[PDB]
RNA sequence: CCUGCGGCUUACACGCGCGCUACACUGACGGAGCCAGCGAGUCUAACCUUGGCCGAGAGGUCUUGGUAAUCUUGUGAAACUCCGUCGUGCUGGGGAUAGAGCAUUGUAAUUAUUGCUCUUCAACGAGGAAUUCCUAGUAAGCGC
């Protein structure tokens, strides 16, 4: 189960959810075509790197 | 090495060093044990598996005759 | 190029000066060391209570080489600490006065202690020579 | 002295392990782990806690050095932590003489729980939602888990803190889950994938 | 006693078989129930004669001697 | 030989299980000096004035379950701890080191001392058996556990087969509530399964003894 | 009467506050500091740890602050208070006695922290005027026409007592609910020098071993 | 164990809260090294002091320094650092608990006023429901 890598393009805004977790748009570092919003919990920023354990999972508005 | 044995009607172990095995009795504390080990001319770091009954009866008599061997009146319980 | 006790280490030169005093042999230590703990805030007696007075005298000689003069109050507060008074708050206490006065008399026997200006403690030519000899012996401790 | 001339050319870590040739194995930790700083001791107490990303400015080794004095019995003791860190580094360089830095970096890279999980209140219905973990967040979590396992080791054991720390670092470098931090990372991944 | 090396001769044989090889540290020299009736943690004290197995690790002290 | 070790939340990865009791009448009702319990047939003014019912309030269900559970052969083999969720929400963890008396007067006195204390002590003064974990049972329990409600309405099966099918690292848990009029829903949200053992309605003591007999022949306990 | 401590700034600028404590507060004293923070508008606070007071106050002064309150205690509960008005203003040093705690009693709603309504009751002497002006210039300038947060100072028997009450204009009269703490506040000195001086012009000290101060208010 | 609001009593079985000490090897005791600031202090009185002295210590000896950066005072502080001793032992962690002796007043300590010393060595194996405060020289810990 090789978890891919993803570089965050930008932190997705207005993602109404529980305070502490945010949706952020990241394009995969394996290939710059796979891009999706993902739910990041830790203190993050833009243009960073992260490990994505799912391939085509995309975040949504979590109320 | 020696295990517990009858000393002043107590059972005292010898595998531990000479200060604390000489402390578990009523009327003797840390400082009293240390100074009687000083006054009985025994090495302070020995455990009492050694120190055969010569020195054991010597510390018996230094208990029952302490002021003979410079145990001061300000040290008394 | 200049040999100083200040160049020499704490534990190393302390053991060296204590052994040199043991090599000197004559210091007239008090008989209370068989029963004393060298402080009122102390709980157990000193482990090497025979060389505890020697270590204290070596530290006093090091201070007398460093500072101009000291006193029994200064020595006692210098060699003083807190106390196991129980559970109440422990302040810092001084060291034993009679042990300090005897040690002050004990170092003038070897000539290490002399009456400083306006009284106090100082070193003499014999004390400075012995300190220099012990330091040079400890200057060759690098092997 | 002689070691003064030796360190005059190469600034090794305390002149006992080389502070060069350190490598970071796992990805997504570049610019999240500070390994590019040539220094002497991990006690550079300059103001770095003020900002968020300036905490990544201090080394992860200095972060673990701060993690040593994390207890009521030791909060605020510096030189105890420094001497314990030197002893633990010597224990690492004895168990694995490659580099204390390289072995510690390998353990940090192999002790990372790649996934996170959150409990969403849901208006009164908490649910387990798998979420990502940030790079400095994952690094801090691994360092904290390691320091916590090391501290929990020395509860009833005459082993030194440096010894238990080196044993946990070896378990993490092997990834054998013989340490609390590696077991915590495995259980965290298992829980995150349990409710993915 | 009855030999003054009681639990410190066969244990010494096991130590010479094992501890002179890997080696352990001053904390791991407490293995095989190194306890009272001899030297529990004083294996480093007697390690002046034996050398060349592994560097030591001193907790209360701070030393690493190749023994 | 020796007895098996302490079977509690500390014994987590080892062979252990939990017996869970709930929906009993266990509180502290001080009669106006000391602390007393809610008795139906004893106090007539107090029970009617409290707001409870004679058929509903049952304080001896826990005592009967403890009498039928603490003497189990599996309990002497070191495989079960006791978890109790009281009517006031109190969660109590009991190791099998001792055995409470079956005398409801003495058991009620010990329970009232626990209610006024939350603290029990040993004769040897070394092992306070009455531990209170962070409530409920599943907040500090073993890391591998099996949760199931043993209902008289759930699927009735033999206790030997289901227990023998379980792994030795998991902790089978059973929830029992001896309501004279009630339902098998006291710890429904905590149970991860719904299984049955008997074809007739039984109290907590009888169902607990049936589960203990099944566990005794499961792994020869 | 507006004073030289306030004439250039009384209704001109609305003030901000800073709440802090003497040295190593007890937890309940910190909680009471939290209450006096949340009662005041423009409320920001900062814990004092190992701080030299000339350095602390001087650093707080260039950053811009109108007033500074700092507390004391006696084994858990507070006893004393002082106010330091920053632009060379007068420090006032009080003894506070009784308290009710919003944590303690009930959650009775909310301290809405709106620009509150101000009440100063039964002040006659020029010292009463000094207390009224100094304390009035700590509240926000500009509550609304119907600001329902009535703060209340009462000056009966030299023990000024403060409460907070929240009112609704019900059918035949207002109706009030009790919030905030309730106090027995009493001053004992006024110094026009700010507390950094330690030696400047003391306006006022309470005579204590004067006989007639059994009876007389205001010295 | 001291202590702030609540029961009952005198010419003691209690309900709400604040703190300190510990529940041991980053530990505990033996010796070595050591970095402060705040101020305070005595004329017709004896303060704050330096030393030498002796007494384990507790405590007593005369004197200058200081009416004040001068003498305390560099308050040589404590945690801190090194090695030594010790092995997790409810031991040497721990001293609540008593008794005795010693100084030491004071008219008397008698109701352990205080201080030393010896002896006595409880609970405490990390504390549930809850629970407050907190975003850097900060929480936290140490002393004058």
Curated annotation (Swiss-Prot), chain A:
- Reported modifications of this chain: N-terminally acetylated by acetyltransferase NatB.
Give the main localization category: cytoplasm
Q: Where's it found, cell-wise?
A: Cytoplasm
A molecular function GO annotation: structural constituent of ribosome
Cross-referenced SUPFAM superfamilies: Nucleic acid-binding proteins (SSF50249)
For this protein, the record's InterPro entries field holds: NA-bd_OB-fold, Ribosomal_eS28, Ribosomal_eS28_CS
GO BP terms: namely:
maturation of SSU-rRNA; positive regulation of nuclear-transcribed mRNA catabolic process, deadenylation-dependent decay; ribosomal small subunit assembly; ribosomal subunit export from nucleus; translation
Q: What are the UniProt keywords, alphabetically?
A: Acetylation, Cytoplasm, Ribonucleoprotein, Ribosomal protein
Annotated Gene Ontology cellular component terms: cytosol; cytosolic small ribosomal subunit
What quaternary structure, including any partners, is listed in this protein's UniProt entry?
Answer: Component of the small ribosomal subunit (SSU). Mature yeast ribosomes consist of a small (40S) and a large (60S) subunit. The 40S small subunit contains 1 molecule of ribosomal RNA (18S rRNA) and 33 different proteins (encoded by 57 genes). The large 60S subunit contains 3 rRNA molecules (25S, 5.8S and 5S rRNA) and 46 different proteins (encoded by 81 genes).
Further remark: Present with 94500 molecules/cell in log phase SD medium. There are 2 genes for eS28 in yeast.
- Give the record's family classification: Belongs to the eukaryotic ribosomal protein eS28 family.
Which HAMAP family does UniProt cross-reference here?
Ribosomal_eS28
Record's protein name: Small ribosomal subunit protein eS28A
- Give the source species: Saccharomyces cerevisiae (strain ATCC 204508 / S288c) (Baker's yeast)
Q: Which gene encodes it?
A: RPS28A
UniProtKB/Swiss-Prot annotation, chain C:
Q: PANTHER family under this entry?
A: 40S RIBOSOMAL PROTEIN S19
- Gene of this entry: RPS19A
- Descriptive protein name: Small ribosomal subunit protein eS19A
Gene3D superfamilies annotated for this entry? Winged helix-like DNA-binding domain superfamily/Winged helix DNA-binding domain
Pfam families, A to Z: Ribosomal_S19e
Species this protein is from? Saccharomyces cerevisiae (strain ATCC 204508 / S288c)
SMART domains attached here? Answer: Ribosomal_S19e (SM01413)
Knockout-associated phenotype:
Disruption of a single RPS19 gene reduces cell growth; a double disruption is lethal. Depletion experiments show the proteins are required for correct maturation of precursor rRNA to generate the 18S small rRNA. A specific site between the 18S and 5.8S precursors (site A2 in ETS1) is not cleaved in disruption mutants. Partially assembled ribosomes are retained in the nucleolus rather than being exported to the cytoplasm. All effects are exacerbated in the double disruption. Increases association of NOC4 with 20S/21S pre-rRNA, decreases association of ENP1, TSR1 and RIO2 with 20S/21S pre-rRNA.
Q: What is the effect of changing residue 101 to E?
A: Decreases mature 18S rRNA, protein binds 20S pre-RNA complex poorly. Lethal in double RPS19A/RPS19B mutant
Q: Outcome of mutating residue 14 to F, per the record?
A: Partial loss of function; decreased 18S rRNA, decreases binding to 20S pre-rRNA complex, slow growth in double RPS19A/RPS19B mutant
PROSITE patterns, per the entry: RIBOSOMAL_S19E
UniProtKB/Swiss-Prot annotation, chain D:
Q: How is it modified after translation?
A: N-terminally acetylated by acetyltransferase NatA.
What residues does the Glycyl lysine isopeptide (Lys-Gly) (interchain with G-Cter in ubiquitin) crosslink join?
Answer: 16, 174
Chief location category: cytoplasm
Q: Name one GO biological process term.
A: cytoplasmic translation
Keywords assigned: Acetylation, Cytoplasm, Isopeptide bond, Phosphoprotein, Ribonucleoprotein, Ribosomal protein, Ubl conjugation
Locations listed in the record: Cytoplasm
Q: Could you say which residues form the signal peptide?
A: none
Q: Does the keyword Phosphoprotein apply?
A: yes
Name the GO cellular-component terms: 90S preribosome; cytoplasm; cytosol; cytosolic small ribosomal subunit; ribosome
Query: Could you give a GO molecular-function term held by this entry?
Result: rRNA binding
Subunit-structure text: Component of the small ribosomal subunit (SSU). Mature yeast ribosomes consist of a small (40S) and a large (60S) subunit. The 40S small subunit contains 1 molecule of ribosomal RNA (18S rRNA) and 33 different proteins (encoded by 57 genes). The large 60S subunit contains 3 rRNA molecules (25S, 5.8S and 5S rRNA) and 46 different proteins (encoded by 81 genes).
> Which family does this protein fall into?
Belongs to the universal ribosomal protein uS7 family.
What's its job?
Component of the ribosome, a large ribonucleoprotein complex responsible for the synthesis of proteins in the cell. The small ribosomal subunit (SSU) binds messenger RNAs (mRNAs) and translates the encoded message by selecting cognate aminoacyl-transfer RNA (tRNA) molecules. The large subunit (LSU) contains the ribosomal catalytic site termed the peptidyl transferase center (PTC), which catalyzes the formation of peptide bonds, thereby polymerizing the amino acids delivered by tRNAs into a polypeptide chain.
From Swiss-Prot, chain F:
- Give start-end of the signal peptide: none
What does the UniProt keyword field contain? Answer: Methyltransferase, Nucleus, Ribonucleoprotein, Ribosome biogenesis, RNA-binding, rRNA processing, rRNA-binding, S-adenosyl-L-methionine, Transferase
For the site labelled Interaction with substrate rRNA, the residues are 58, 99, 102, 106
According to the UniProt record, what class of enzyme is this? transferase
Instruction: Tell me the Gene Ontology biological-process terms attached to this UniProt entry.
Output: endonucleolytic cleavage in 5'-ETS of tricistronic rRNA transcript (SSU-rRNA, 5.8S rRNA, LSU-rRNA); endonucleolytic cleavage in ITS1 to separate SSU-rRNA from 5.8S rRNA and LSU-rRNA from tricistronic rRNA transcript (SSU-rRNA, 5.8S rRNA, LSU-rRNA); endonucleolytic cleavage to generate mature 5'-end of SSU-rRNA from (SSU-rRNA, 5.8S rRNA, LSU-rRNA); maturation of SSU-rRNA; ribosomal small subunit biogenesis; rRNA base methylation; rRNA methylation; rRNA processing
CC terms in the record's Gene Ontology section: 90S preribosome; cytoplasm; nuclear microtubule; nuclear periphery; nucleolus; nucleoplasm; nucleus; small-subunit processome
Listed under subunit, the entry gives: Homodimer. Interacts with snoRNA U3. Interacts with NOP14 and MPP10. Component of the ribosomal small subunit (SSU) processome composed of at least 40 protein subunits and snoRNA U3.
Q: What is this protein called?
A: Ribosomal RNA small subunit methyltransferase NEP1
Query: Which organism's genome codes for this protein?
Result: Saccharomyces cerevisiae (strain ATCC 204508 / S288c) (Baker's yeast)
């Amino acid at each position: 189960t090789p978890v891919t890598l993803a570089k965050v393009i930008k932190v997705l805004g207005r993602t109404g959810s529980r305070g502490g977790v945010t949706q952020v748009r990241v394009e995969f570092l394996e290939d710059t075509s796979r891009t999706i919003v993902r739910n990041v919990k830790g203190p993050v920023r833009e243009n960073d790197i992260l490990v994505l354990m799912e391939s085509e999972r995309e975040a949504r508005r979590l109320r | 090495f020696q295990h517990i044995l009858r000393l002043l009607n107590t059972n005292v172990d010898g595998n531990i060093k000479i200060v604390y095995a000489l402390t578990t009795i009523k009327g003797v504390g840390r400082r009293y044990s240390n100074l009687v080990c000083k006054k009985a001319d025994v090495d302070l770091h020995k455990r009492a598996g050694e120190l055969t009954q010569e020195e054991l009866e010597r510390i018996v008599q230094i208990m029952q005759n302490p002021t003979h061997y410079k145990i001061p009146a300000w040290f008394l319980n | 190029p200049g040999v100083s006790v200040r160049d020499v280490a704490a534990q190393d030169f302390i053991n060296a000066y204590a052994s040199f005093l043991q090599r000197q042999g004559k210091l007239e230590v008090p008989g209370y060391v068989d029963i004393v703990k060298t402080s009122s805030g102390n709980e157990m007696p000193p482990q090497d209570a025979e060389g505890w007075f020697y270590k204290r005298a070596a530290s006093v000689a090091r201070h007398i080489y460093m500072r101009k003069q000291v006193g029994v109050g200064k020595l006692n507060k210098l060699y003083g600490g807190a106390k196991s008074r129980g559970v109440r708050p422990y302040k810092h206490i001084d060291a034993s006065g009679s042990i300090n006065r005897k040690v002050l008399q004990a170092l003038e026997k070897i000539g290490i202690v002399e009456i400083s200006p306006k009284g106090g403690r100082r070193i003499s030519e014999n004390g400075q020579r012995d300190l220099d000899r012990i330091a040079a012996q400890t200057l060759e401790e690098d092997e | 002295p002689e070691e003064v001339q030796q360190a005059q050319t190469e600034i090794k870590l305390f002149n006992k392990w080389s502070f060069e040739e350190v490598e970071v194995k796992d990805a997504s930790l570049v610019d999240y782990v500070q390994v590019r700083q040539p220094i002497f001791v991990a006690h550079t107490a300059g103001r770095y806690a003020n900002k968020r990303f300036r905490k990544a400015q201090c080394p992860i080794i200095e972060r673990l050095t701060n993690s040593l004095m994390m207890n009521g019995r030791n909060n605020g003791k510096k030189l105890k932590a420094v001497r314990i860190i030197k002893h633990t580094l010597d224990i690492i360089n004895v168990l694995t003489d490659q580099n204390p830095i390289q072995v510690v970096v390998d353990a940090i890279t192999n002790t990372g729980p790649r996934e996170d999980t959150t409990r969403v209140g849901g208006g009164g219905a908490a649910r387990r939602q798998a979420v990502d973990v940030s790079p400095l967040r994952r690094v801090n979590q691994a360092i904290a888990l390691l320091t916590i396992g090391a501290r929990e080791a020395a509860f009833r054991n005459i082993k030194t803190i440096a010894e238990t720390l080196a044993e946990e670092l070896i378990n993490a470098a092997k990834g054998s889950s013989t340490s609390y931090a590696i077991k915590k990372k495995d259980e965290l991944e298992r829980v995150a994938k349990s409710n993915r | 006693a009855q030999h003054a090396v009681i639990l410190d001769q066969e244990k010494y044989d096991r130590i010479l078989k094992e501890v002179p090889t890997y080696r352990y540290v001053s904390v791991s020299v407490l293995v095989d129930r190194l306890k009272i009736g001899g030297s529990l943690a004083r294996i480093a004290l007697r390690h002046l004669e034996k050398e060349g197995i592994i560097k030591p690790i001193s907790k209360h002290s701070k030393q690493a001697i190749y023994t | 030989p020796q007895a098996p070790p302490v079977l509690t939340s500390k014994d987590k990865i080892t062979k252990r299980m939990i017996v869970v009791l709930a929906m009993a009448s266990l509180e502290t009702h001080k009669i106006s000096d000391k602390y007393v319990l809610l008795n139906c047939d004893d106090h007539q003014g107090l029970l009617k004035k409290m707001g409870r019912d004679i058929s509903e309030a049952r304080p001896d269900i826990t005592h009967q379950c403890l009498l039928t559970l603490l003497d189990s052969p599996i309990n002497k083999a070191g495989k079960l701890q006791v978890y109790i969720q009281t009517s006031r929400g109190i969660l109590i963890e009991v190791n099998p080191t001792v055995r409470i008396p079956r005398t409801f007067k003495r058991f009620s006195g010990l329970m009232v001392q626990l209610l006024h204390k939350l603290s029990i002590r040993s004769v040897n003064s070394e092992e306070k058996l009455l531990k209170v974990i962070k409530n409920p049972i599943t907040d500090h329990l073993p890391t591998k556990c099996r949760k199931v409600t043993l209902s008289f309405d759930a699927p009735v099966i033999r206790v030997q087969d289901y227990i023998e099918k379980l792994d030795d690292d998991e902790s089978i848990c059973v929830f029992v509530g001896a309501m004279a009029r009630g339902k098998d829903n006291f710890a429904d949200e905590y149970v991860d399964e719904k299984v049955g053992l008997s074809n007739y309605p039984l109290s907590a003591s009888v169902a607990c003894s049936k589960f203990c007999h099944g566990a005794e022949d499961a792994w020869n306990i | 009467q507006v004073d030289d401590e306030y004439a250039a700034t009384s209704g001109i600028m609305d003030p901000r506050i800073i709440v802090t404590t003497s040295r190593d507060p007890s937890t309940r004293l910190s909680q009471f500091a939290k209450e006096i923070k949340l009662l005041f508008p423009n409320a920001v606070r900062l814990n004092r740890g190992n701080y030299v007071m000339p350095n602390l106050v001087d650093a707080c002064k260039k950053s811009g602050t109108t007033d500074l309150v700092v507390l004391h205690e006696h084994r858990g509960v507070p006893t004393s208070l002082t106010i330091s008005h920053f632009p060379h203003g007068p420090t006032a040093q009080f003894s506070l006695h009784n308290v009710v705690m919003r944590h303690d009693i009930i959650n009775a709603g909310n301290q809405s922290e709106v620009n509150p309504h101000l009440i100063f009751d039964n002040f006659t002497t020029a010292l009463g005027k000094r207390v009224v002006c100094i304390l009035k210039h700590l509240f926000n300038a500009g509550p609304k026409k119907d600001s329902e947060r009535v703060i209340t100072f009462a000056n009966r028997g030299d023990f000024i007592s403060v409460r907070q009450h929240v009112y609704v204009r019900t059918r035949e009269g207002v109706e009030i609910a009790e919030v905030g703490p309730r106090f027995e506040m009493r001053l004992f000195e006024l110094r026009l020098g700010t507390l950094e001086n330690k030696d400047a012009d003391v306006e006022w000290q309470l005579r204590r071993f004067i006989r007639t101060a059994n009876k007389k208010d205001y010295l």
